[PDB]
Amino acid sequence: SRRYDSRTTIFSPEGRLYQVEYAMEAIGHAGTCLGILANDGVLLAAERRNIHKLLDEVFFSEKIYKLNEDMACSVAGITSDANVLTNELRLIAQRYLLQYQEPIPCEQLVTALCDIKQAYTQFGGKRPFGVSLLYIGWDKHYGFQLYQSDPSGNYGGWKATCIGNNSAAAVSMLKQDYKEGEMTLKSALALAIKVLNKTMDVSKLSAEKVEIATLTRENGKTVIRVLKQKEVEQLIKKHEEEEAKAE
Amino acid sequence: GYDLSASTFSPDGRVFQVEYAMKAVENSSTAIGIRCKDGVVFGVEKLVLSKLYEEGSNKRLFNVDRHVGMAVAGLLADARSLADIAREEASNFRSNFGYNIPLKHLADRVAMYVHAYTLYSAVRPFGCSFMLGSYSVNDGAQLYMIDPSGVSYGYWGCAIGKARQAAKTEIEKLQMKEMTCRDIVKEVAKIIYIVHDEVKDKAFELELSWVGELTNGRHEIVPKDIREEAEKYAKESLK
Amino acid sequence: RGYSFSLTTFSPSGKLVQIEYALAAVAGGAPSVGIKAANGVVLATEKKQKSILYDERSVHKVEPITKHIGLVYSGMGPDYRVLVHRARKLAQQYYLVYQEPIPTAQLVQRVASVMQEYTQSGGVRPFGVSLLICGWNEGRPYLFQSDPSGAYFAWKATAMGKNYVNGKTFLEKRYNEDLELEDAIHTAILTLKESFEGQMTEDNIEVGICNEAGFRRLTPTEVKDYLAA
Amino acid sequence: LRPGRLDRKIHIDLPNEQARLDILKIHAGPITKHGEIDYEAIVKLSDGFNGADLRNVCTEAGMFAIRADHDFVVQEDFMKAVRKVADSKKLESKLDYKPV
Amino acid sequence: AEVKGVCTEAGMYALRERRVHVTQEDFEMAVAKVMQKDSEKNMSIKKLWK
Amino acid sequence: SKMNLSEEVDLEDYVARPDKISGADINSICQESGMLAVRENRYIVLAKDFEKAYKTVIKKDEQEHEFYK
Amino acid sequence: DEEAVQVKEQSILELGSLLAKTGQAAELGGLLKYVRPFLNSISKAKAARLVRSLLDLFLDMEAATGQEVELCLECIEWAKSEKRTFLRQALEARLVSLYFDTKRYQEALHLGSQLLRELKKMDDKALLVEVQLLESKTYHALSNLPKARAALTSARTTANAIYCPPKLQATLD
Amino acid sequence: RGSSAGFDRHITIFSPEGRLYQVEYAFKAINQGGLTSVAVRGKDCAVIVTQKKVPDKLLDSSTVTHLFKITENIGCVMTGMTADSRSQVQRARYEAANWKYKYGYEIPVDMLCKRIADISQVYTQNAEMRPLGCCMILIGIDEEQGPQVYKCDPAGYYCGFKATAAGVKQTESTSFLEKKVKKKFDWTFEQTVETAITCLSTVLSIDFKPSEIEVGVVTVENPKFRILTEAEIDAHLVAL
């Protein structure tokens, strides 16, 4: 019936997809996400929004997701569309693995998912997925990697990025304080703690309103880890101490 | 905007499209069915739009099975589609359960088929009301009716059409219970003439039918001689 | 044929409005509670029928999924029935494939994923229900919530439905991680009582538990005994 | 509407079957009539009517009786009147409002 | 406005006590009343919205 | 206090009822009770009279169809 | 023997009610010491009902037999062992009331104030107004008029935000 | 409270206040027939009574009805739109037949009501179609549960009842019946047939005749649903 149709897949009078624009407008309110590619690691730093004394601790994380042995991604937007996209990503990785017996390279994967998303915003009459992704991984083609996606289907390799709340501010400092090719994993983590401390203007890093991820190569194989409470709080104490000495 | 589809209720609990369709059925002429001891009798007033049509153009009595008849009023396209559906139901019943369809069951199946057209937006309600009537040694004489809403109810006498109220006030006087089809026929012509309006419409030719003990349970057009005598008696009664 | 276009669409502020209205319906239902004791998990809702003519035993709101995991809701009824059926079917499919009882986290994930589909699919509207699931898997209690948006949350203790904000304040006051099952169910019974509008007769509330022994509803005589205190 | 100003809120709804019979009798009294008049039939064909509608059934009944140029109201004219006034009712919007 | 009302209320309570001075206990009771009526107004507005 | 109000009536029952009622109504219940009393030609008020009064003055809103909750 | 256990618990409840009505305080105490191993044969919830009801029945009368303090201490210790908390709180409140009845003024304060602290940590209101009123009565017994009045006012405030039963309203007034 | 956002009053979607207006209107259509029914649960007998309006003397009174048998043991009243009522009755008969085919024993009342309410829930989720404007009441004997009385509505609510009324006069009848069930037991003998007739007569204020109601009964001694004839109905009518 044409009376109730929404036309979620039709051009506006200036060639801009409105449902897509609103989808990207939803992301600018979910938790902030940060990307930093070091010379010896990659790292995702999003904010833990589910901040209540009556929530339980479950799973190894709350926003970081594994996709292969050598790949992980974090989400900003709707939680449910996030779950749907994560599942499809896992399926893509396993299908490539089954066909070639090699781990799926990273741009292999990111473009497969974005192709699903783009197709979804091209025809069908559905609403688009209101999710923007950040990924991390290693493959024998380009080493440590950091990609990003949007409701449109566009992606991009970023040496450092920010998708989500206060994206402008975070990318502004990331431009001011990024050493292209001159970053260790430790320095990148410290830069993340600083930038996030700015952005999460509500209080300071409580070591509990934050999520951090690291992807490294150890003993010839990838190792993915989510920073515990003690190390995160120690890093924050180091950050405050450094800022105090600086003043 | 509460009356654009049959998939929407009015704020007072009504499906308007069905009400409009049933309104359409009151623009078509009048039909009559009277049940008696022997059987059923249908009589329809067929308006002659132009002088150029044949006799028997757009007959408004059909045969859905060899023992069943069918009178219609409203959109003729809907009437013919529903005639097709009733024929299909009868044939399927005979092929499956091995005997002539009892009329009640046919009325139920046809009505369900009509009612299914009054739930969705993708289709629109039939613009026709119709009356089925058969006769068998076991089940006796029956006469039913199904309206666009899909409600089926048995009747001792009914009139579907434009002048439905006038006929209804007229059919109520027969005492049809204790007569046979042969006199019911003269009555039916009498009514169809009493209700006809000569100021508005130009002229008509009757279509009469019956099914009763006089047919061995076969529905068939009333023979020419009896029809003419009935018409003549009706003419005289309209002094 | 059936509508092939989504009926929940993004707004200029990037909000899926229909989901917000479903949440409004949930917030306008009957109260519900769930706590995670150290040695059990307790659900409890209110079942105040409209007259003396309703059979309290005719239907129940706290329903199990398997021998060891069950759920209750607050919102609309028929939607809760549908979701109970879907949960039981998904549990049985998991058992058939794996020959082991379904873990609660996974059943919640699966039912929620079923809940997302109706936010985006064509010609359908979101469920007007939120559920809480309780299980005892891996010798460990589990309490989850699932909302019309398809999002789930692990809870230590929660209370949803009408006047759920005040209930969450109460439970924030009364949680103690070293709690024991009887005390937990008592605290729950209280929370419902925080706003009830009448006398809590045995036949106006429900409760269900989970422990090693297995998820199992409480019989009314048991309910009266616990309500004794 | 406060119960110190308007103490009683009396509802006066549409007539029921027995009440319909009463009103029909009250209005149909002063007519000059011939033959049996089975008010059950009209009470049965007058669902949803109100006192005015049944008064109009009587008025229309006499109008029909004159239209024929007789000098009485017979039963059949009553049936015609009831069916007519049933036809005109399709215009009125049937619903009721309560004090809430 | 709430903190302006608490002052006048507390003074008037102290006056009922028949004294020249306001007391901390009186202030506590006044602030309790003023904040209770403020929350009552807020919940009344919420109910009106409902 | 100005009634004849036989000792049978237990007002605690009427006050307990979770029903938001304004003071003007609370006077119509007590007035309709005596009204029924006079209708039946008494000068005492029984529990039934009061029950009918309270059911008369406090008509309960249109029960939301119970497929909510 | 579940039916036998139900019969026995019903019999003990009835016998305790009868003895409390007759005032057989020594027999009530012997009965209470008799059901001591009964905890392992009844539900924790119904063990709670039984112990609390029996303690209330015994304490309803004012027969100064002398076992009130020791019986209450044993019951509170049993509650602690059984991790009852809420019942433990009610028992402690009643024990401090008894300590007031038994002309013990200074000592009963510190435990009462500990109750007030533990209970401000939570937010029970009826018990809180009760204990605050008892503390005010104790301060009146010790003649600490200003602190007693302050406690009374605090208890009044706490009672304002909650509907009061008739007994409680009478005691407050 | 009464906001509208888009088509919330045209298709079955939520209103800003979490309300399905189309389901509500459908409930409003149950009264468009102008009829009422009552059901009462006795100790060994369950009864359903209903009006029977012969609008005029041209209908065949034997055909106009609102009692139907789903199985030989389970019988139901239909109230509201007639075509929708027939559709739901057909679906119920098919469902019961399939239950006995698949599971080897006759269908419990409650489970049939559950299946039918689920069907209606699908009707009130998808927006292509509209909810039916009819309500059911079922009655029969359970093996180990005693007499059962159950009803269902357009939204999908299938509560089981001790005494029920459906139709235009739902609230008055429900009030009367609530008071009775308060009195002693809500009727505790096969002369529960008298209580239902009294309730209908009082609510509608009718003073029924033999030919203006139709009853159905199920007894523990005679589980098969039976449709009370005119002679028996007149006997009961005289009894009071």
Swiss-Prot record, chain B:
Positions bearing N6-acetyllysine: K51, K200, K224
Domain of life: Eukaryota
A biological-process GO annotation: proteasome-mediated ubiquitin-dependent protein catabolic process
Keywords for this protein: Acetylation, Cytoplasm, Host-virus interaction, Nucleus, Phosphoprotein, Proteasome
Annotated positions of the Phosphoserine modification: S237
Induction of the gene: Down-regulated by antioxidants BO-653 and probucol. Up-regulated by bacterial lipopolysaccharides (LPS) and TNF.
PROSITE patterns in the cross-refs: PROTEASOME_ALPHA_1, PROTEASOME_ALPHA_2
Quaternary structure note: The 26S proteasome consists of a 20S proteasome core and two 19S regulatory subunits. The 20S proteasome core is a barrel-shaped complex made of 28 subunits that are arranged in four stacked rings. The two outer rings are each formed by seven alpha subunits, and the two inner rings are formed by seven beta subunits. The proteolytic activity is exerted by three beta-subunits PSMB5, PSMB6 and PSMB7. Interacts with AURKB. Interacts with CDKN1A. Interacts with MDM2 and RB1. Interacts with the C-terminus of TBXA2R isoform 2. Interacts with DNAJB2. (Microbial infection) Interacts with HIV-1 Tat protein.
Protein name: Proteasome subunit alpha type-3
Lineage summary: Eukaryota, Metazoa, Chordata, Craniata, Vertebrata
Swiss-Prot record, chain F:
Modified residues (N6-acetyllysine): K48, K52
Localization per Swiss-Prot or TrEMBL: Cytoplasm; Nucleus
Task of the protein: Component of the 26S proteasome, a multiprotein complex involved in the ATP-dependent degradation of ubiquitinated proteins. This complex plays a key role in the maintenance of protein homeostasis by removing misfolded or damaged proteins, which could impair cellular functions, and by removing proteins whose functions are no longer required. Therefore, the proteasome participates in numerous cellular processes, including cell cycle progression, apoptosis, or DNA damage repair.
Oligomer and partners: Component of the 19S proteasome regulatory particle complex. The 26S proteasome consists of a 20S core particle (CP) and two 19S regulatory subunits (RP). The regulatory particle is made of a lid composed of 9 subunits, a base containing 6 ATPases including PSMC4 and few additional components. Interacts with NR1I3. Interacts with PAAF1. Interacts with TRIM5. Interacts with ZFAND1.
Family listed: Belongs to the AAA ATPase family.
Protein name, UniProt field: 26S proteasome regulatory subunit 6B
From Swiss-Prot, chain G:
Cellular location(s): Nucleus; Cytoplasm, Cytosol
Protein modification: Phosphorylated by AMPK.
Induction: By FOXO4; expression in embryonic stem cells (ESCs) is mediated by FOXO4.
Tissue: Highly expressed in embryonic stem cells (ESCs). Expression decreases as ESCs differentiate.
Subunit structure: Component of the 19S proteasome regulatory particle complex. The 26S proteasome consists of a 20S core particle (CP) and two 19S regulatory subunits (RP). The regulatory particle is made of a lid composed of 9 subunits including PSMD11, a base containing 6 ATPases and few additional components.
Homology family: Belongs to the proteasome subunit S9 family.
Job description of the protein: Component of the 26S proteasome, a multiprotein complex involved in the ATP-dependent degradation of ubiquitinated proteins. This complex plays a key role in the maintenance of protein homeostasis by removing misfolded or damaged proteins, which could impair cellular functions, and by removing proteins whose functions are no longer required. Therefore, the proteasome participates in numerous cellular processes, including cell cycle progression, apoptosis, or DNA damage repair. In the complex, PSMD11 is required for proteasome assembly.
Protein name per UniProt: 26S proteasome non-ATPase regulatory subunit 11
Species this protein is from: Homo sapiens (Human)
Gene name as annotated: PSMD11
Full-sequence range covered: 39 to 211 of 422
From Swiss-Prot, chain H:
Residues with PTM Phosphotyrosine: Y157
GO terms under cellular component: cilium; cytoplasm; cytosol; extracellular exosome; mitochondrion; myofibril; nuclear matrix; nucleoplasm
Primary site of residence: cytoplasm
GO molecular function: endopeptidase activity; NF-kappaB binding; purine ribonucleoside triphosphate binding; RNA binding
Glycan attachment points: S3
CDD domains linked: proteasome_alpha_type_6 (cd03754)
An individual GO BP term: proteolysis involved in protein catabolic process
Locations listed in the record: Cytoplasm; Nucleus
N6-acetyllysine sites (modified residues): K100, K102
Keyword Cytoplasm applies: yes
Keywords: Acetylation, Cytoplasm, Glycoprotein, Nucleus, Phosphoprotein, Proteasome
Job of this protein: Component of the 20S core proteasome complex involved in the proteolytic degradation of most intracellular proteins. This complex plays numerous essential roles within the cell by associating with different regulatory particles. Associated with two 19S regulatory particles, forms the 26S proteasome and thus participates in the ATP-dependent degradation of ubiquitinated proteins.
Protein name from the UniProt record: Proteasome subunit alpha type-6
Species, as recorded: Homo sapiens (Human)
